[PDB]
Design a protein around this motif. Sequence first.
Motif, PDB file in Angstrom:
ATOM      1  N   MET A 224      32.369  35.153  -0.137  1.00 40.74           N
ATOM      2  CA  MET A 224      31.961  36.542  -0.041  1.00 40.74           C
ATOM      3  C   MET A 224      32.128  37.083   1.375  1.00 40.74           C
ATOM      4  SD  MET A 224      28.763  36.337  -2.650  1.00 40.74           S
ATOM      5  CE  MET A 224      28.369  37.965  -2.039  1.00 40.74           C
ATOM      6  N   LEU A 225      31.812  36.263   2.371  1.00 37.38           N
ATOM      7  CA  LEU A 225      32.010  36.662   3.762  1.00 37.38           C
ATOM      8  C   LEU A 225      33.477  36.561   4.186  1.00 37.38           C
ATOM      9  CD1 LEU A 225      28.833  35.192   5.468  1.00 37.38           C
ATOM     10  CD2 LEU A 225      29.354  37.587   4.963  1.00 37.38           C
ATOM     11  N   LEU A 226      34.192  35.597   3.617  1.00 37.02           N
ATOM     12  CA  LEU A 226      35.601  35.401   3.932  1.00 37.02           C
ATOM     13  C   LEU A 226      36.493  36.490   3.341  1.00 37.02           C
ATOM     14  CD1 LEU A 226      35.618  31.559   3.362  1.00 37.02           C
ATOM     15  CD2 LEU A 226      36.129  32.699   5.534  1.00 37.02           C
ATOM     16  N   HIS A 227      36.071  37.055   2.214  1.00 41.30           N
ATOM     17  CA  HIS A 227      36.890  38.007   1.465  1.00 41.30           C
ATOM     18  C   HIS A 227      36.354  39.437   1.491  1.00 41.30           C
ATOM     19  CE1 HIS A 227      38.180  40.116  -2.278  1.00 41.30           C
ATOM     20  NE2 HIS A 227      39.351  39.600  -1.954  1.00 41.30           N
ATOM     21  N   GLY A 228      35.051  39.588   1.705  1.00 45.29           N
ATOM     22  CA  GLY A 228      34.405  40.887   1.555  1.00 45.29           C
ATOM     23  C   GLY A 228      34.003  41.054   0.104  1.00 45.29           C
ATOM     24  N   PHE A 229      33.086  41.977  -0.166  1.00 40.11           N
ATOM     25  CA  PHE A 229      32.563  42.138  -1.519  1.00 40.11           C
ATOM     26  C   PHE A 229      31.934  43.507  -1.733  1.00 40.11           C
ATOM     27  CE2 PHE A 229      29.219  40.334   1.077  1.00 40.11           C
ATOM     28  CZ  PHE A 229      28.076  41.005   0.696  1.00 40.11           C
ATOM     29  N   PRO A 230      31.926  43.978  -2.987  1.00 40.70           N
ATOM     30  CA  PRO A 230      31.266  45.236  -3.311  1.00 40.70           C
ATOM     31  C   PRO A 230      29.751  45.077  -3.228  1.00 40.70           C
ATOM     32  CG  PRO A 230      31.993  44.156  -5.314  1.00 40.70           C
ATOM     33  CD  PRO A 230      32.517  43.332  -4.172  1.00 40.70           C
ATOM     34  N   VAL A 231      29.075  46.090  -2.697  1.00 44.28           N
ATOM     35  CA  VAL A 231      27.641  46.010  -2.454  1.00 44.28           C
ATOM     36  C   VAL A 231      26.812  46.701  -3.531  1.00 44.28           C
ATOM     37  CG1 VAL A 231      25.776  46.636  -0.884  1.00 44.28           C
ATOM     38  CG2 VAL A 231      27.985  45.875   0.027  1.00 44.28           C
ATOM     39  N   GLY A 232      25.802  46.002  -4.034  1.00 40.63           N
ATOM     40  CA  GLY A 232      24.828  46.605  -4.933  1.00 40.63           C
ATOM     41  C   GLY A 232      25.411  47.133  -6.227  1.00 40.63           C
ATOM     42  N   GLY A 233      26.504  46.521  -6.671  1.00 43.02           N
ATOM     43  CA  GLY A 233      27.155  46.913  -7.920  1.00 43.02           C
ATOM     44  C   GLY A 233      27.985  48.178  -7.797  1.00 43.02           C
ATOM     45  N   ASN A 234      28.195  48.622  -6.561  1.00 43.93           N
ATOM     46  CA  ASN A 234      28.988  49.814  -6.286  1.00 43.93           C
ATOM     47  C   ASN A 234      30.408  49.438  -5.874  1.00 43.93           C
ATOM     48  OD1 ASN A 234      30.088  52.257  -5.482  1.00 43.93           O
ATOM     49  ND2 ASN A 234      28.323  52.884  -4.244  1.00 43.93           N
ATOM     50  N   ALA A 235      31.363  49.674  -6.765  1.00 43.48           N
ATOM     51  CA  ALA A 235      32.750  49.317  -6.490  1.00 43.48           C
ATOM     52  C   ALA A 235      33.340  50.039  -5.280  1.00 43.48           C
ATOM     53  CB  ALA A 235      33.612  49.560  -7.717  1.00 43.48           C
ATOM     54  N   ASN A 236      32.792  51.206  -4.946  1.00 43.57           N
ATOM     55  CA  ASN A 236      33.295  52.000  -3.828  1.00 43.57           C
ATOM     56  C   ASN A 236      32.522  51.768  -2.533  1.00 43.57           C
ATOM     57  OD1 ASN A 236      33.627  54.556  -6.293  1.00 43.57           O
ATOM     58  ND2 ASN A 236      35.276  53.235  -5.529  1.00 43.57           N
ATOM     59  N   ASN A 237      31.742  50.691  -2.497  1.00 41.27           N
ATOM     60  CA  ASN A 237      30.973  50.336  -1.312  1.00 41.27           C
ATOM     61  C   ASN A 237      31.240  48.888  -0.921  1.00 41.27           C
ATOM     62  OD1 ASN A 237      29.168  50.409   0.806  1.00 41.27           O
ATOM     63  ND2 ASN A 237      27.346  50.181  -0.486  1.00 41.27           N
ATOM     64  N   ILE A 238      32.397  48.654  -0.311  1.00 40.54           N
ATOM     65  CA  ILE A 238      32.859  47.301  -0.044  1.00 40.54           C
ATOM     66  C   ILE A 238      32.481  46.850   1.359  1.00 40.54           C
ATOM     67  CG2 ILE A 238      34.863  45.762   0.004  1.00 40.54           C
ATOM     68  CD1 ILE A 238      36.294  48.075  -1.695  1.00 40.54           C
ATOM     69  N   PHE A 239      31.780  45.723   1.448  1.00 38.22           N
ATOM     70  CA  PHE A 239      31.492  45.105   2.732  1.00 38.22           C
ATOM     71  C   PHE A 239      32.736  44.356   3.191  1.00 38.22           C
ATOM     72  CE2 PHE A 239      29.674  41.920   5.602  1.00 38.22           C
ATOM     73  CZ  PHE A 239      28.866  42.721   6.379  1.00 38.22           C
ATOM     74  N   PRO A 240      33.247  44.699   4.380  1.00 32.60           N
ATOM     75  CA  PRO A 240      34.518  44.138   4.814  1.00 32.60           C
ATOM     76  C   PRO A 240      34.440  42.653   5.142  1.00 32.60           C
ATOM     77  CG  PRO A 240      33.482  45.258   6.628  1.00 32.60           C
ATOM     78  CD  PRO A 240      32.631  45.539   5.422  1.00 32.60           C
ATOM     79  N   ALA A 241      35.551  41.958   4.939  1.00 34.34           N
ATOM     80  CA  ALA A 241      35.647  40.559   5.309  1.00 34.34           C
ATOM     81  C   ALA A 241      35.388  40.412   6.793  1.00 34.34           C
ATOM     82  CB  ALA A 241      37.023  40.035   4.991  1.00 34.34           C
ATOM     83  N   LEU A 242      34.693  39.346   7.174  1.00 35.09           N
ATOM     84  CA  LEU A 242      34.634  38.954   8.573  1.00 35.09           C
ATOM     85  C   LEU A 242      35.891  38.163   8.894  1.00 35.09           C
ATOM     86  CD1 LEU A 242      30.931  37.664   8.841  1.00 35.09           C
ATOM     87  CD2 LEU A 242      31.840  39.905   9.507  1.00 35.09           C
ATOM     88  N   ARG A 243      36.135  37.914  10.174  1.00 36.06           N
ATOM     89  CA  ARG A 243      37.189  36.980  10.538  1.00 36.06           C
ATOM     90  C   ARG A 243      36.777  35.626  10.007  1.00 36.06           C
ATOM     91  NH1 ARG A 243      36.309  39.203  15.742  1.00 36.06           N
ATOM     92  NH2 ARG A 243      35.311  37.235  16.373  1.00 36.06           N
TER      93      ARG A 243
END
Length: 325
Positions: A224-243
């Motif tokens: 999830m940290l390597l790839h990034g993920f949608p937040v709180g079931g919101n497809a348009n609210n993506i937490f960006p991947a870290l390095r």
Amino acid sequence: LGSKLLVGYWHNFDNGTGIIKLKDVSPKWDVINVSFGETGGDRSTVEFSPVYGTDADFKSDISYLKSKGKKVVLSIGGQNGVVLLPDNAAKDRFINSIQSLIDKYGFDGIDIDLESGIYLNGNDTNFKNPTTPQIVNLISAIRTISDHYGPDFLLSMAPETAYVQGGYSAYGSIWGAYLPIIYGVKDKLTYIHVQHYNAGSGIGMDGNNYNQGTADYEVAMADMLLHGFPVGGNANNIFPALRSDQVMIGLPAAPAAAPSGGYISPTEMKKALNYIIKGVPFGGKYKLSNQSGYPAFRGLMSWSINWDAKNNFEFSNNYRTYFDG
């Protein structure tokens, strides 16, 4: 700083595992997280006194380790190290007291290990633009402190899973609460090692629930940290991947180091590591987001150096040899 690290927490206290003087810490550890800064009535002025040695002795031991290329980091947390920054005045006391300690002992960074007093208030819905004072102020203080030291300064954090990967399920209260902190300090963040223990179950980006202490769980949570993920079931609210070089996994050094579960045998963890780092699968249920892995994955954190020494040095020996290999 090396490309594959072992980060170990160091008890500034005796919890039954005993005290290990700094110079007696196994050299297999690359970073030593001195645990912990302590706070008093005002929950904002951080204090620290070494469990052994005069202040000068302790400072000298830190200097010795630094001369050998090790990093010695002050960890903020613990039951007696709660930090509350409800306003600017508290924030400033926090900043000043920590800088005073860094100046006094020569720490070469700080670790954020706060597991209480951190909540997304109602209406605090945007991880890029937090509104809760505690969160806004922690971010500000962390940036300020980091900016006060060079040319390098180590910043790490060890939130529990609900605060990070839990953001996949909900964004509010503790759920996702470190996401704005991570995002707010990402350009200062050396690495993050979420505590993959005392954590029960975690939902992966495949929507499946995984059990702590299993290879699938480790991969699913790190991805999830390597790839990034949608937040709180919101497809348009993506937490960006870290390095990838900012991502670690925090593990118990021994079964007893995590009384509510989470310990994973090195044999099983190496399966997870080979998959994360090299894209080499092990017949697990979880499918990695990147087929050929994340070679720059930064390494492992452990609670703790002291527990490790009481468990045949299992963690340090197994994983140092693995990473060196």
